[PDB]
């Protein structure tokens, strides 16, 4: 009978918990106990779905990660390089989803705890992007070492920079958040150059379907749709107070992140099989 708490409306929330105006009732009150925060996972409030979505997604991708790391070395041509190349993706996805549900659980703890776990959440998003670009770059430029190393270095530089700019303090000033968006913008848009490079180095038609670039376009559209649903905060923008617990904008963005990471894995795996069975050579027919 300890750690009792009820939900509260949006009006009586502290400033550091007023991060969405269209969620009227059902908010957790500030509770400076990790025990109560973790216990609240099994209770209904505004953050229940946002916790469970990426909790299940983390379990799912951890399952896929270790299971794929157990695939025997026979099925891979270069097992060591290709497995660490896949380990980057599965690690970044696991860390991203773990940081996400951890932040959403301890979100009501205190201002500083929510602050630090918010930074971890942004760093997790950057890690997921870097992880997603490691195996795609490997299996798209597997016969071209120079551009693979170049694009990998650019993405890693912008990813590391994205993590660092969002972790250290004194950059929370109004005029440094511009470069906060700038580094993440260079990170996000860094995939346009190698995509067209791949679509030009080989035929557009062979890359559209058998090159699995339509699946990369599918996940990109889903990522942009999720970011738009997030910034607009719909459907709760038009029906305020009706999507408090379920089907808020943040929950469908979490689901879209999971689905986009899954279709990325499927598109990469088809880029694998098409590259194992076919292609590889350059200038000889015989």
């Amino acid at each position, epitope marked *: *009978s*300890e*750690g*009792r*708490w*009820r*939900v*509260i*409306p949006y009006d*009586v929330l*502290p400033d550091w918990l007023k991060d969405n105006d269209y969620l009227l*009732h059902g908010h*957790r*009150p*500030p*509770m*400076p*106990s990790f*025990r*109560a925060c973790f216990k609240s996972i099994f209770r209904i409030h505004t953050e229940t779905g946002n916790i469970w979505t990426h909790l299940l997604g983390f379990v799912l991708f951890l399952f896929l990660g270790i299971l794929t790391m157990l695939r025997p070395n026979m099925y891979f041509m270069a097992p060591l390089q290709e497995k660490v190349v896949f380990g980057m993706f599965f690690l970044g996805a696991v860390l991203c989803l773990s940081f996400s549900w951890l932040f959403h659980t301890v979100y009501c703890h*205190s201002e500083k705890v929510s602050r630090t776990f918010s930074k971890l959440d942004y760093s997790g998003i950057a890690l997921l992007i870097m992880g997603s670009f490691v195996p795609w770059l490997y299996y798209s430029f597997y016969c071209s070492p120079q551009p693979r190393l170049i694009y990998l270095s650019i993405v890693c530089v912008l990813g590391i920079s994205a993590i660092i700019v969002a972790q250290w303090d004194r950059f929370a000033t109004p005029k440094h958040r511009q470069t906060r968006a700038g580094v993440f913008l260079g990170l996000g848009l860094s995939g346009v150059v190698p995509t067209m490079h791949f679509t030009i180095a080989e035929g557009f038609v062979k890359a559209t379907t058998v090159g699995q670039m339509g699946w990369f376009f599918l996940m990109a559209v889903m990522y942009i749709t999720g970011a738009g649903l997030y910034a607009a905060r719909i459907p709760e923008r038009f029906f305020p107070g009706k999507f408090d617990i379920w089907f808020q904008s943040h929950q469908i963005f979490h689901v879209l992140v999971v689905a986009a990471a899954f279709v990325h894995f499927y598109g990469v795996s088809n880029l694998q099989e098409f590259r194992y069975g076919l292609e590889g050579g350059c200038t000889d027919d015989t």
Partner: antibody
Amino acid sequence: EVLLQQSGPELVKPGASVRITCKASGYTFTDFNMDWVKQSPGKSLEWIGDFNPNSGGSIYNQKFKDKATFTVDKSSSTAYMELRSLTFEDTAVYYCARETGTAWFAYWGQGTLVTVSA
Amino acid sequence: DIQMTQSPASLSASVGETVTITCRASGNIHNFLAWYQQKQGKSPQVLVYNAKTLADGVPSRFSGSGSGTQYSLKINSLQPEDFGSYYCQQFWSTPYTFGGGTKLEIN
């Protein structure tokens, strides 16, 4: 702003059963629990118990198990406490205090003095 | 039943000076603590909740700190209207309990 108005003073005889009222204004009545506090003269505070007007439930301290009884009027948005079998040790100021999410009290009533003497 | 032991019984200071009131809980209340002020005849008013959160409207000279079983309310630049009895309460375990209180006089 939230206001909690309590009933006026009470002078009763040993064995009587008095009731304290607590009218709440300025907020949605069912949104928060409401606790009751006793303060005997020249002494510290004592938590009598809390009342959930959403479920109409209540939890009582062991030291006030049979003496306190909480009731509600969700229509008039007014919570009541009842003290029966009053003895001389019950002469005290009784407050109603509203919680927010956890059991810290930001809003209090003005207090009701219950005095007992034959 | 967690027992809250407040300290001291009473203390005095002059305007502008700093005072500190300590509170020890017989068990861990996990920062579920509140500090209240009560002037003579008046009802108590909340000063701090969640161990270190300043309540809305409270002057900045009040500040709560501590954790586990040890907590402290500090008052900078004492003001004449700061006299009265200060109380602590734990709202972690039921039944919720209060400290013995601390009487504060100003000279």
